[PDB]
Amino acid sequence: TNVCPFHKVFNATRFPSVYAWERTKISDCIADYTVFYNSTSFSTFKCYGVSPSKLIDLCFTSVYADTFLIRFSEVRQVAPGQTGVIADYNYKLPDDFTGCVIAWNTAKQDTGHYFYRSHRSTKLKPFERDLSSDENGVRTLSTYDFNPNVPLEYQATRVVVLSFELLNAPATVCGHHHHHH
Ligand SMILES: *[C@@H]1O[C@H](CO)[C@@H](O)[C@H](O)[C@H]1NC(C)=O
């Protein structure tokens, strides 16, 4: 298997709006997570259920990459069992979450009008997506203008959620060293 398509996911011209986040299936690859933790580009790299350090030793049966665009202020909501407009009405990470979250501040590039759900009748189920714009005829989706000139807690920020499972089925996405190194 050839190397894992991270640059094609990460350095794409556009990231989705967060209410319409997008999944990607990754398999048959040899993953190189080295790019992340650049400390001058990746401002947040935090794993749940495994050690970011232990990613280099592990093989995964299925890896999905959920992607979207929010503000710096709201990055902290992408965590198991957190509360917020994002976690309650946009993108929900399970309580039993296994995976990583990577986030970096693309403010000078991902500029424009992006959207987010502010209100919903019920909160969200884990990993559920709601692409509806109305409830009773009112727009249920409020707007972000991302600009270079807004303060940091308010700036554009791209997020990726690598969600994997270590159960049965052929082991398909293997770190550079799943041969006991
Ligand atoms: C880390 O980020 C900087 C940002 O300018 C980039 O130049 C560099 O190539 C990245 N990583 C490496 C492998 O040096």
Side-chain angles (χ1 to χ4, degrees):
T1 56
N2 202 40
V3 189
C4 221
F6 285 165
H7 177 258
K8 311 79 188 179
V9 175
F10 280 61
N11 217 5
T13 51
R14 184 117 195 165
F15 260 60
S17 300
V18 46
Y19 88 101
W21 57 278
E22 309 179 13
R23 208 171 196 87
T24 292
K25 187 165 192 172
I26 324 168
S27 42
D28 304 351
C29 80
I30 288 297
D32 220 298
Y33 322 79
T34 310
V35 260
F36 334 132
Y37 51 71
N38 175 291
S39 80
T40 222
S41 153
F42 293 88
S43 56
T44 299
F45 184 170
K46 306 304 178 174
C47 300
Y48 303 68
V50 74
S51 314
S53 43
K54 262 270 168 62
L55 291 170
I56 319 289
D57 308 327
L58 263 64
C59 283
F60 300 116
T61 53
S62 57
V63 190
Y64 305 116
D66 307 344
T67 50
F68 47 75
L69 188 82
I70 56 163
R71 290 168 159 136
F72 218 122
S73 288
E74 322 166 60
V75 187
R76 31 200 308 285
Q77 316 188 15
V78 186
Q82 294 248 321
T83 52
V85 59
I86 302 307
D88 288 337
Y89 310 127
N90 287 270
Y91 175 72
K92 190 54 165 192
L93 266 197
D95 46 278
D96 44 324
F97 184 54
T98 309
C100 296
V101 176
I102 321 161
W104 66 104
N105 186 315
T106 65
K108 341 256 150 232
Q109 56 157 308
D110 267 23
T111 72
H113 281 283
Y114 290 75
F115 299 86
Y116 69 105
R117 186 179 306 276
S118 35
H119 179 77
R120 195 172 178 273
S121 35
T122 40
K123 277 175 185 168
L124 287 194
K125 317 268 182 58
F127 281 121
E128 163 193 317
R129 208 198 309 105
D130 217 292
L131 303 126
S132 63
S133 180
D134 282 11
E135 187 142 357
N136 280 321
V138 281
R139 225 193 202 273
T140 66
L141 300 171
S142 290
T143 317
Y144 298 132
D145 183 42
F146 291 116
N147 237 12
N149 295 297
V150 302
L152 172 73
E153 280 322 281
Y154 276 84
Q155 295 202 18
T157 301
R158 290 187 181 188
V159 172
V160 169
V161 177
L162 298 194
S163 40
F164 38 67
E165 171 101 56
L166 292 106
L167 240 270
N168 28 42
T172 194
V173 180
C174 288
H176 261 35
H177 285 147
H178 196 78
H179 287 164
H180 314 66
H181 320 264

